[PDB]
Amino acid sequence: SVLLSRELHPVAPLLDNLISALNKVYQRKGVNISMDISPEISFVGEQNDFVEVMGNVLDNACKYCLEFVEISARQTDDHLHIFVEDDGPGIPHTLRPGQGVGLAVAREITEQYAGQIIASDSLLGGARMEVVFGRQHPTQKEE
Numbered sequence: 001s002v003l004l005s006r007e008l009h010p011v012a013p014l015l016d017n018l019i020s021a022l023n024k025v026y027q028r029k030g031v032n033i034s035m036d037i038s039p040e041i042s043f044v045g046e047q048n049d050f051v052e053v054m055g056n057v058l059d060n061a062c063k064y065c066l067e068f069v070e071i072s073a074r075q076t077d078d079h080l081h082i083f084v085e086d087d088g089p090g091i092p093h094t095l096r097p098g099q100g101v102g103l104a105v106a107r108e109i110t111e112q113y114a115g116q117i118i119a120s121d122s123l124l125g126g127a128r129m130e131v132v133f134g135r136q137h138p139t140q141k142e143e
Helices: 011-025 047-065 103-111
Strands: 001-007 008-009 032-036 042-044 067-075 079-086 115-121 129-132 137-143
Touching: 001 011, 011 032, 011 042, 011 047, 011 067, 042 047, 042 079, 047 067, 047 103, 047 129, 103 115, 103 129
Parallel strands: 032 067
Antiparallel strands: 001 137, 008 042, 067 079, 079 129, 115 129
8 A cells, every 4th residue: 555754854953953042041050061862863753843842851951950961862663762861959769850840841742752751860960861752663654
């Protein structure tokens, strides 16, 4: 029958822009953001959604971090994993929240993509947020 490839969007370039904007927003605080994502990593789906989810998670990380934020990523045939770590307060054993309070938007959108957001401890000392997006198969049937 009819099989179509789906639109893939390279991740690094998308995060690059978000990072530049946040760097300016939190420059007085002096936030240092680094990203190590291979050019191969991509996202399948509405580009605006990925940008909206990551914009929220990165902004949150800048607020809770002390001065460092690190971004990384990994993919699996059907999932895209984005990791955002900070050196802020730990997580629910100061301490802060895996802050689902202001990650309501990120959680909503990720839910759409059959994914989820998980909080764990980072080596930097703060939270390590994993944003998982599902429905990442590169092809699908329909016109």
